[PDB]
Amino acid sequence: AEVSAEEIKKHEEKWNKYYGVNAFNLPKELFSKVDEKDRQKYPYNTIGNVFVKGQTSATGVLIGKNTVLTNRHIAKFANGDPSKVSFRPSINTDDNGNTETPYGEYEVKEILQEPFGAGVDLALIRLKPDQNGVSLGDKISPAKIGTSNDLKDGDKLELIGYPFAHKVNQMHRSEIELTTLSRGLRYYGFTVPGNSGSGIFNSNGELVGIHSSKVSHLDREHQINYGVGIGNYVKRIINEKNE
C-alpha cells in the first residue's frame, strides 16, 4: 500500500510538533516534568524507574501488590537474574545532586520475561517486600487496569515515565495522540528510549497500554511510537499472573 505524499506530509508535520524543537522547548501541554506534589497522587505514584545492571534505566508500572509491568526488551537484559533488576517507584533526582526514593528501592524476586509471548513486548517483574515486610502495593494503590478495546484513532492519552536521555531519574508526562490502531497502539508523542515501559492512561486513570518503542510508519523512512495495549489477551494474562 503506497501512502500518498499528502499523507506523508501531514504525518511529518504532526511528528514535527514533538521533535521539531528541543525537548526543553516543547509546550508543557505536550511534555512536562511531574512536580513533587503531582508525584504524590494517582496515577503518577504508580510509575517507577526500572534499573537493569549494565543498561540505562527505563520505566515500569505497579499493577499488583508485588507486580510491575514493563517491556520484555527491558527485562531481557537481566538474563533471567532477579538480582540484576531493581524498581525505584517515584524516584526523583534533582539537577543539584539530590535523590529521593519516598517508598524506598525494591528488590526483585522473579522475572517473567515473556509471559505474553516473545512478540509482545511486555514482562512482569515480581518484587520482594521491603526489609520490614511491606509490599510496594501496600504503600501505594497499584494502577487500575483498563482495556485498549474502547480506544480510537485520534484519542489523546497520557504517557507517564522516565525519559532518561532527556533527564535522569525525573518522571515526566507526555500527551500522546493515537493513530492507525489496526496493528496495535501507535501514537504521536514525545518519547525517548528510557520511556520504555511507561504507563499510558485514559482520563479515568485506567492503564490502557504500555509504551514500547518507535517503529516504521507509512513507509520505511518515517516512524511512530508503538505501545502494547491492554487488549483481551494481555488483560487475560495479567489477571492470571498478577500478584
Set of cell numbers at residue 142: 497499584
Set of cell numbers at residue 226: 508503538
Amino acid code (one letter) for 135: S
For residue 102, being part of any structural domain is answered with yes
Does 182 qualify as catalytic in the annotation?
A: no
**Active-site entry in 11, 121, 174, 212:** 121
Among 142, 177, 211, which residue terminates a domain? Answer: 142
Q: Tell me, yes or no, whether 129 and 60 share the same domain.
A: yes
DSSP string, the chain: -PPPHHHHHHHHHHHHHHHSS-GGGS-TTTEEEPPHHHHTSTTGGGEEEEEETTS--EEEEE-SSSEEEE-HHHHGGGTT-GGGEEEEET-EE-TTS-EE-TT--EEEEEEES-TT-TTS--EEEEEPP-TTS--HHHHSPPPEE--STT--TT-EEEEEE--TTTSTT--EEEEEEE---BTBEEEE----GGGTT-EEE-TT-EEEEEEEEEEEESEEEEEEEEEEE--HHHHHHHHHH--
Q: Return the HEC string of 33-61.
A: ECCHHHHCCCCHHHEEEEEECCCCCEEEE
d(CA 216, CA 35): 33
DSSP string, 187-207: EE----GGGTT-EEE-TT-EE
Among 142, 168, 184, which residue terminates a domain? Answer: 142
- For residue 82, the domain's CATH number is 2.40.10.10
Does 222 qualify as catalytic in the annotation?
A: no
d(CA 43, CA 217): 30
Q: Sort strands 47-52 and 58-62 into parallel, antiparallel or unpaired.
A: antiparallel
Task: For residue 17, give the nearest of 187, 222, 188 by alpha carbon.
Answer: 188
Range of the domain at 108: 47-142
C-alpha atoms less than 13 angstroms from C-alpha of 199 in its C-beta half-sphere: 31
d(CA 174, CA 191): 7
d(CA 227, CA 221): 19
In angstroms, what is the resolution? 1.4
For residue 236, being part of any structural domain is answered with no
Q: Tell me, yes or no, whether 92 and 162 share the same domain.
A: no
Q: How many domains does the chain have?
A: 2
Using a 10 angstrom Cβ sphere, with 0-12 exposed, 13-18 middle and 19 or more buried, the burial of residue 25 is: exposed
Among 127, 142, 157, which residue terminates a domain? Answer: 142
Instruction: Report in angstroms the alpha-carbon separations of 6 from 10, 25, 178, 187.
Output: 6, 28, 19, 19
Q: Sort strands 144-145 and 206-217 into parallel, antiparallel or unpaired.
A: parallel
d(CA 94, CA 116): 36
Instruction: Report in angstroms the alpha-carbon separations of 234 from 2, 69, 103, 116.
Output: 32, 11, 28, 7
Q: Tell me, yes or no, whether 131 and 80 share the same domain.
A: yes
Query: 217 Cβ partners below 8 Å, 6+ apart?
Result: 11, 179, 180, 186, 223, 224
**Active-site entry in 32, 38, 73, 213:** 73
Instruction: Report in angstroms the alpha-carbon separations of 66 from 7, 73, 192, 201.
Output: 45, 20, 27, 20
Amino acid code (one letter) for 205: G
For residue 77, being part of any structural domain is answered with yes
Does 216 qualify as catalytic in the annotation?
A: no
- Asked if 53 and 102 count as a contact pair (C-beta separation under 8 A), the reply is no
d(CA 226, CA 187): 7
d(CA 238, CA 68): 11
For residue 74, being part of any structural domain is answered with yes
d(CA 126, CA 144): 17
- Asked if 52 and 75 count as a contact pair (C-beta separation under 8 A), the reply is yes
**Grid cell 517483574 — which residue?**
125
Query: 224 Cβ partners below 8 Å, 6+ apart?
Result: 11, 15, 179, 180, 186, 187, 188, 214, 215, 217
Q: Tell me, yes or no, whether 103 and 189 share the same domain.
A: no
- Asked if 70 and 60 count as a contact pair (C-beta separation under 8 A), the reply is yes
For residue 194, being part of any structural domain is answered with yes
Task: For residue 172, give the nearest of 139, 187, 153, 194 by alpha carbon.
Answer: 194
**Active-site entry in 86, 90, 135, 196:** 196
Write phi, then psi, for 201 (nearest 5 degrees): -120, 145
Is-cis flag, bond preceding 193, omega within 30?
Answer: no
Q: Tell me, yes or no, whether 169 and 153 share the same domain.
A: yes
